[model samples]
Target: HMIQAYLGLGSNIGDRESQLNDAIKILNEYDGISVSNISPIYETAPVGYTEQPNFLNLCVEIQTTLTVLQLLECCLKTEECLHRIRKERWGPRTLDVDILLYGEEMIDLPKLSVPHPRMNERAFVLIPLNDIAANVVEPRSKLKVKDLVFVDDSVKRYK
Candidate 1:
């Protein structure tokens, strides 16, 4: 069965732009997953751990047969391949891929969370998501993505 999903890719270290491109290619080439489309890349200021360099961020929509955990694994593996080494919370990364949404299912487990826990809180997530899936409903909140409150300086497609 094909289940639709959305993923966000971000980079703040090394060649941040190519870092996103490489991982997008990897996702497109992965088994049991098909890249449907992607949002334009945006250069965003560091949000949480604010001292890092600006990041290039974007989102992709996909169709996949993998379970939520499997999808999470794919994102993690993609990050690892891009040389992501986590030494601090919300710190710099060569590449960061997050499972933003999985079909219409709401998930919460120790190792994973769907409709991503902090997606709504950051314009970094909502803006690109709205651009790609404006009418898409967030099942848990019964809200359209474009209607969500977004961070003012979160993003723009200039990059």
Candidate 2:
């Protein structure tokens, strides 16, 4: 059986949209991974570490049989392929891939976590997530995704 996972992809470096697309392509090429749906890219102001260019962000729903750790490794490899150098947490990057949900699995390991701890608190994540998976319920939180949509600030939809 495959697990359904939601991922948030973002980029603020050169050709942000292209970076997102490339990351998606790379993700689709992995074995046991399939891209189910992707939200239209959006431009949003930076959240945590501000003082940088606005970010191009989107959400993707994927079906994969890989374990959470395996999926995380694939994400890290995709970031590396995009020349992502982790200088600071939440800093600018060529690509950023975060696992938003993992088939209702709740885990807290050294390098991976499911149902992303702060996913509901970020407008960027929630906006695109709402666009694609509005009816989906958060695994661990047991909260309807639609409920969290109205909690964040207004998010502008890109043309």
Candidate 3:
């Protein structure tokens, strides 16, 4: 069966656009994963660790047969392949790929969470998400994705 999943991509290191593009390439190359749609890339300042360079972020919708855990593992592996190191929590990195939503499934495992716990709170995530998934509804809250997009106060599109 195919599952719909949303992924948030961001890069603040060298060649931000290249990094994001490479990530999308990697995602498409993975078995059982296919990119469904991608939002326009948005440039924004750093969020949690405000000390690094600004980030170029975007969201992608994918159709996959992988289970949630399998998908999360793929994301982590992609980050590592891109030379992302876990130094400081929310620290700067060459690339960051987060599993934002997983087929409207609610999961609370130790390593992953669906409808990402903090996604609704960040404009960087919600804005691009809305671009690709305007009608998306949070599985747990039943709130329209666009509603959350209106309230976030983070940085907006760069240009």
Candidate 4:
């Protein structure tokens, strides 16, 4: 069985654009995962720590047979392979890959969180995700991606 999963990706360091593409490529090569839809890349002002470069952000919907934990493990492995530096929380990176949602499952683990606890606030995550996932509903709020609204946006689609 395949679960529809959503992932939010971002990068602000060296070849950010290509980093995203590489990350996506790694994802597609994973044993139990395949990309289903990809959102347009967006250039956004960095969140949290902004002393660095602006970020290239995007989202992807994936079809995966892996369980949530297995998928999360794969994401971490991909980040490591893509050379993610964990120097700071929400800091700039080579690749930032997050499990935004995994089917209808709500998960809270020491290492992972589903429906991404901050997904509702980050325009970088929401904008791209809504592009490809407007009809996908959040299990908790029962709100479709398109039904969610926010007042602030520092994100814009990149050409």
Summarize candidate 4's per-residue lDDT along 1-159 as a digit string, tens digits: 788999998888899898899999999999999999999999999888778899999999999999888888898888898888665775777888899999988988787789898898788887788889888898778899888845446887694
Global lDDT for candidate 3? 0.87
Instruction: Give the clashing residue pairs of candidate 3, or none.
Output: none
Model 2 Cα lDDT, one tens digit per residue, 106-136: 9987667788988878888988998899889
Clashing pairs in 4: none
Model 4 alpha-carbon miss at residue 60, Å: 0.5
Locate the minimum summed-lDDT window of 10 residues in model 1: 149-158
- Per-candidate Cα lDDT values, in order, are 0.86, 0.87, 0.87, 0.87
Q: Which residue runs does candidate 3 get wrong by more than 4 Å?
A: 151-154
Show the lowest summed lDDT stretch of 10 residues, model 2. Answer: 150-159
Q: Residues 38-78, candidate 1, lDDT per residue (tens digit)?
A: 88888887898888888888889999999888888899899
TM-scores of the models, in the order given: 0.94, 0.94, 0.93, 0.94
RMSD to the hidden true structure, all candidates? 1.3, 1.5, 1.6, 1.3
User: Of models 1 and 3, which has the larger TM-score?
Assistant: 1
Worst 10 residues of 3 by lDDT: 150-159
lDDT of 2 at 39: 91
State in Å the error of residue 101, model 4: 0.7
